[PDB]
Amino acid sequence: MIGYFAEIDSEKINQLLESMDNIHDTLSGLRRLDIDKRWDFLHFGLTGTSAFDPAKNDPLSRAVLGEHSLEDDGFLGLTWNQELAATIDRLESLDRNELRKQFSIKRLNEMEIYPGVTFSEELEGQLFASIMLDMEKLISAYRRMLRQGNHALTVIV
Template sequence: MGMLGQYVMVDEDTLERMMEMDGSELMDTLEKLIESGSEYYDIDKLWEELHLALTGVSASEPIEGDPLSEAVVGVHVFEVEEEDGFFACTEQDELEDIIAAMQQVDFDQLKTDGVAEELRAALKGEFAGLLDFYGKALAGGKHVIFSVA
């Protein structure tokens, strides 16, 4: 996939409105939320590598029901045209299980053979940043929208 990934916290009303939008409306809404001060986490292009490190498979093949896969790519995929990007949400009540699974990961024990040390360190940092972001979302009672564009 190789495109930029971003996570944005949203409240219940915003999530409900977004579920009715098409891809271009979703992207516009996310950009406006960020500009207006909504908390977000920018994982850049490393979401694909992080998914691979955590699950052993590409993010283009997410593993339904796997909290580590869902940590990276979200739980509920929005039905939008492929050219509009990828959007998924993780609802607030799903964050606890994802956080618990992430807290069990010993990043130093992951099979990242052949991955340069610099990339491994970057992935470890992104993992920690994403875990912290999810903790804030859970504490704030927010849902998380993951987008790739």
Template sequence: MRAAYTLIDEGTLDRLVSLSPDVLLSTLEELEEAGAPTVYVDKMWDGLHFLLTGVSASAPREDDPLSEAVVGVHAFGGDDFVGCTENDELEPIIDALDAVDLDEALAKVDFAAFASARVYPNIWTDDPAQLRAELTDAFAELRRVHQQAADAERHLVISIY
């Protein structure tokens, strides 16, 4: 499973909202293939959510900008996970990401807690230095895509598949 963060305009968001859940993910994949700006956090999305919030993304925290950074503010219905953050909702999320002291968080990280909480993927007994490096890269991508969406005055659609 991986998380894809795709920048979209207002018309595309309106179209996505009107789709039935069974075609939403395939439509997003078509947008990505057609060149819609997309950033992938790959397998580290749940690990980032746990690092930033202390809970798995399977139980996102409402009104928590760090949780929303990973899974979005709004969730589409259906079996697949698709969320959205509208352009006017990006600023507090970016501010929250900017306030994270990632070096401090990673210095104190307890990967055994990730394993105990069954955070996806089941890699938390791997080399801690490698895990820290992957989380660092994923955080940088997460921060970058939110800023990119804000700068482009676009909405951000998050799909985890």
């Protein structure tokens, strides 16, 4: 289960919605930020929960999974161009020190965040830093999509 955030324009998303088995073909031609199997680390780092069990009405969960859950055999989420500015502002507003304070490698190991492997507790700082790097890559992707008039698709499958 790899995760990526794709950029889709209006004509293509409407075409997609007018029609997620073989989603990797309809999206095959779209630009994407691919974060391999680190998508749940990212979800956890921003929300304290797994994407497999998010808190109800969690805007930060939606910041990663998308404003709209089109599917959930792998997630497919959508965030309209009209919704990206808010998502971007939400992520840029986060206090990094705050996120770090909340991040616990012990909680991550216990909650069995995907892929479900344990980490030495000595890697807490490094893992967190790695997550912040993915968050920064996502922010840059969203900003590009917003500025170009496109929409975002979170694909996890």
